[PDB]
Subunit: 162 residues, 3 copies
Amino acid sequence: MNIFEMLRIDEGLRLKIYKDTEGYYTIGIGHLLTKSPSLNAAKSELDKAIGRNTNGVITKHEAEHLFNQDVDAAVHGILHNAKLKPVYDSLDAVRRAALINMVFQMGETGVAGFTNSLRMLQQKRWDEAAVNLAKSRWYNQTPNRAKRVITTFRTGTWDAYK
Amino acid sequence: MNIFEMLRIDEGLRLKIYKDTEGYYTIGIGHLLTKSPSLNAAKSELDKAIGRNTNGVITKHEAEHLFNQDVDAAVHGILHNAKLKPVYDSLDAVRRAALINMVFQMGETGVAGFTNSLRMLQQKRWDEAAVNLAKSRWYNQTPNRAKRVITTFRTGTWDAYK
Amino acid sequence: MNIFEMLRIDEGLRLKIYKDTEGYYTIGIGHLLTKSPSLNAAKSELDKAIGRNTNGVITKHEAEHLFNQDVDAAVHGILHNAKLKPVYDSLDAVRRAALINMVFQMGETGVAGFTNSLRMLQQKRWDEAAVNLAKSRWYNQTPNRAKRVITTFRTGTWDAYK
Ligand SMILES: [Cu+2]
């Protein structure tokens, strides 16, 4: 198990352009294409990223192309963030994946807003962080895409994934 | 062994644009580019599929790009075909590959024309189907690309491939 | 171990356009883009090779795209060269990688200029070749990118790589 399979399971794979939980055009493994209402704009953006006329359809491999890039961006955002780097430094390989998972889903700024939880994670207070993270809007709007992630912060194992 | 390696062996790999058994421009693993006599048209079509100026030459990976797509198309054609779906449902994992193999080579309509053989396969009559499939024009025009496939319908093993 | 990992170690991976040991724009695993002083020209050349607007940045996979092509070109250059083919024929699997390595780095013409060493390699004179190859400008300008390669010609093992 690793961050890729972890997100593969949490996000899932969709090989054709679709609207997300906010009506935003998305594809592959949770990759946002545009906030524009235009499907042609979504197709235009996908074509530039992939490098060919896709007409809104891609392969499992091209989904991994956008996937590796997105994961790297999430990790990069964590390393150059003052509020996230100390937390990332302190964590173990497994809980580090859970952090990247949240940033992948919400972005670095959004995750850096969990003042309490980030403090509790830094201080190995696993249960307090889990309880606090359940209270979030993040959990309310997406309880399924989040349930496993919080359990991972609690246990430090991959048991919620297999 | 699987459908990919099965077709990899039956079709073979060609990394530059070539004419097939009917004079049609083809590339990679039996991928038809165009029925047009124009090589520039074949190059034009390849460029659109791959996503770059190839000038008639591709890599082993880009051949797999067209390969996965073609295999998926063959499977899709079988699942949404009334004459093929019952046959596919009834067959075992190995003989299911042989069916996809024929559709890959001939298309769903062409394979659905083997009324007798499809009936015999549905009724586990392995030898009767093999005998009938040897009588076909499919076997006459391409005895080599077909010999293994028929043997697989007969035995239900991968022995003709290794 | 193989030629790919051998070059992966000797060349290294760089995912953004950079200047080489002569000021030439390069990317991935030692792939030369252009001798032009223009970065836009380097970007223009990269875009044509990869097949998308990269703006000077590529993925590990796209670096492997250029990598496989470059390795194949080096091997092809050896097989169709009168001065290199006899040497390649005579060598063992491991020392054959070392030859491809030099051609990858210098080109077929540049490697075919080592009259003495090529003769000594053809005659299994391992130590004489190593001594001669250390005297070269190739070793002086790039002692690190060369040290392992010469040691491989000497020993016939992968010990300098791991
Ligand atoms: Cu690829």
